[PDB]
């Protein structure tokens, strides 16, 4: 390379009462090469050289205080935890950070559709030990019990997708952290905001379908179990045409029930 | 004599989005977007160099107020809005580079 700069004598607006200036220039000299300076005046010569490394390091414009703590992700608005897969704090980031999205909130469904008592989909605010269960009114009285099979099946699936969504697994992850123009940055944030909006929709569509299925499966399991011994009493209830003690309902809900035992007894009450 | 089949419910649930629904109430949900911050940069695990009253170019050229920055290293240099120069007036044609 070669850099020729001509000194320009002329007064410029006074800065710290100086009408003069110094224009700074730089030159990188490669291991083989030689630095050659020719000057007949006005040169601001070097005193030596600087070490010039690859990358990884950076600069940030921020007025946020530095504090004694450990956080992997830095933004000009202070450090942020990298739990969640996305963030809305700042498009400027230094560590292993969540991606920047326009959205300030993306709610990931981690449950089932809310259909409450107050206004088969019989939403019970009273069932808090499981996502799906049974309510009976027999000879002995009333009672409620949750089905832990359908519940654990729903929990396990939400656990699976949740972990995959928030990293915390062993991989090359689903939403890999960003490391790190205007137009390019806006193009990026629009495509990433689209991704986040679609992913959450897809994920939640699956979770609703998931939980709706588990409920339908448990109702049909009961239907195939009771068979002719009961009738689909409109809503989410069945009408068992015999008497069942707290042990008979237990046998239905715990799966150890058969139509042959209560066969003739059910055939009697039905034809009346 | 009457066996009912239901599910869990909450008085007020969280409204979410699916493929067929833009507003759908669910029992439980979680956040996927970090909106909040303490308002402070953490020292660990990165080397932070607080420029203070100095700009990186001022620390590079060697402005007296920036003598403390000599031969210093960093993972991230933190440049302050209130930083100023206090040596010979200068201009860097192609400063950002």
């Amino acid at each position, epitope marked *: 390379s070669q850099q020729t700069v001509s000194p320009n004598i002329g007064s410029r607006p006074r800065v710290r009462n100086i009408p003069s200036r110094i224009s700074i220039y730089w030159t990188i000299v490669k291991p083989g090469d030689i630095l050659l300076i020719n000057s007949t005046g006005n040169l601001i010569a070097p005193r030596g050289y600087f070490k010039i490394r690859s990358g990884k390091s950076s600069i940030m414009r921020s007025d946020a205080p530095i504090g004694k703590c*450990n*956080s992997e992700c830095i933004t000009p608005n202070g450090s942020i*935890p990298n739990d969640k897969p996305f963030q809305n704090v700042n498009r400027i980031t230094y560590g292993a950070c969540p991606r920047y999205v326009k959205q300030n909130t993306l709610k990931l469904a*981690t*449950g089932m559709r809310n259909v409450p008592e107050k206004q088969i989909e019989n939403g019970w605010e009273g069932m*808090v*030990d*499981g*996502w799906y269960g049974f309510r009976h009114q027999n000879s002995e009285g009333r*009672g409620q*019990a*949750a089905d*832990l*099979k359908s*519940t*654990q*099946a729903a*929990i*396990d699936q*939400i*656990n*699976g997708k*949740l*972990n995959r969504l*928030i*990293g*915390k*697994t*062993n*991989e090359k992850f689903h939403q890999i952290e960003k490391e790190f123009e205007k137009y390019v940055e806006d193009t990026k944030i629009d495509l990433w905001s689209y991704n986040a909006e679609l992913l959450v929709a897809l994920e939640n569509q699956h979770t609703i379908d998931l939980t709706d299925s588990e409920m339908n499966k448990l109702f049909e399991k009961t239907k195939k179990q009771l068979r002719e011994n009961a009738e689909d009493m409109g809503n989410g209830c069945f009408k068992i045409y015999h008497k069942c003690d707290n042990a008979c309902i237990g046998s239905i809900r715990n799966g150890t029930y058969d139509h042959d035992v209560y066969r003739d007894e059910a055939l009697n009450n039905r034809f009346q | 004599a009457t066996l009912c089949l239901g599910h*869990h419910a*909450v008085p007020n649930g969280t409204i979410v989005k699916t493929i067929t629904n833009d507003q759908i109430e669910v*029992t*439980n949900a979680t956040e996927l977007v970090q909106s909040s911050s303490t308002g402070e940069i953490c020292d*660990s*695990p990165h080397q932070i160099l607080d420029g203070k009253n100095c700009t990186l170019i001022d620390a590079l050229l060697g402005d007296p107020q920036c003598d403390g920055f000599q031969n210093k290293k960093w993972d991230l240099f933190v440049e302050r809005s209130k930083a100023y120069s206090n040596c010979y007036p200068y201009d860097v044609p192609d400063y950002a580079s």
Partner: antibody
Framework: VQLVESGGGVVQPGKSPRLSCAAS?????VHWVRQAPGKGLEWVTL????????YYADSVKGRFTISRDNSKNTVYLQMNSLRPEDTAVYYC??????????????????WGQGILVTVSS | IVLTQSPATLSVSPGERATLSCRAS??????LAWYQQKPGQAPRLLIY???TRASGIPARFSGSGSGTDYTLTITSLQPEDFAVYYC???????????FGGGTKVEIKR
């Protein structure tokens, strides 16, 4: 939601000591996790929120009994058919919620102070 | 299902990072919880659902894993973190509850 335990001290095999775990005013399910001296944690039993279901480990199956008096807001670990392998610090625990629901089998977000029993004669 | 914790003891100096492993005999679908037990007192819940950190627990405790291989990380270990740690499995349909052997986070000297 502090938990308080009682019924410790030294006990001679043949006796049937009763371990009590009281609350602070509704009701969840209650588990019992024991720790032998110098050894690690071992899950022994649990009782449902209502009491309909009770689960015991193979170690204490047929020897230990779990009951609950909602009226007194307590759970009772009735331990009979003693073995000197029951010398442990007994901790009662409350299962934590998962995705809004509180099923009996889970992590423990609430623990009792710990009560030591000594099967020795 | 059986939980195997490694190492039985881990020698760490303050400032350093600790990596506590929990191996399950078969897939536990992230139903794991981590506890800190100081001498004399009851175990303290740190993480649940393998990755979810308990209310008020310092940010340095990081729970991860999948399949049968799970991990507990303490990014910048404080002198108050030297204790015994136990991983815990739990399940409602196949009813199960197991605790690992435990690992001692000992002061490196």
């Amino acid at each position: 939601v502090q938990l308080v335990e009682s019924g410790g001290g030294v006990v001679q095999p043949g006796k049937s000591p009763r371990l009590s775990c009281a609350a602070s005013g509704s009701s969840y399910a209650v588990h019992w996790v024991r720790q032998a001296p110098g050894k690690g944690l071992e899950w022994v039993t649990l009782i449902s929120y209502d009491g309909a279901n009770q689960y015991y480990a193979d170690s204490v199956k047929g020897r230990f009994t779990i009951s609950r008096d909602n009226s007194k807001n307590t759970v009772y670990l009735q331990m009979n058919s003693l073995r000197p392998e029951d010398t442990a610090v007994y901790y009662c625990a409350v299962p934590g919620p998962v995705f809004g629901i509180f099923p009996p089998w889970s992590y423990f977000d609430n623990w009792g102070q710990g009560i030591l029993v000594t099967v020795s004669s | 299902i059986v939980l195997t914790q490694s190492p039985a003891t881990l020698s760490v100096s303050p400032g350093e990072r600790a990596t506590l492993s929990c191996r399950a005999s078969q897939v536990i679908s992230h139903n794991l919880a981590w506890y800190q037990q100081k001498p004399g007192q009851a175990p303290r819940l740190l993480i649940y659902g393998a990755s979810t950190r308990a209310s008020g627990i310092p940010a340095r405790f990081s729970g991860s894993g999948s399949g049968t291989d799970y991990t507990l990380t303490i990014t910048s270990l404080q002198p108050e973190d030297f204790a015994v740690y136990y991983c815990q499995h739990y399940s409602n349909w196949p009813p199960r509850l197991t605790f690992g052997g435990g690992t001692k986070v000992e002061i490196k000297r």
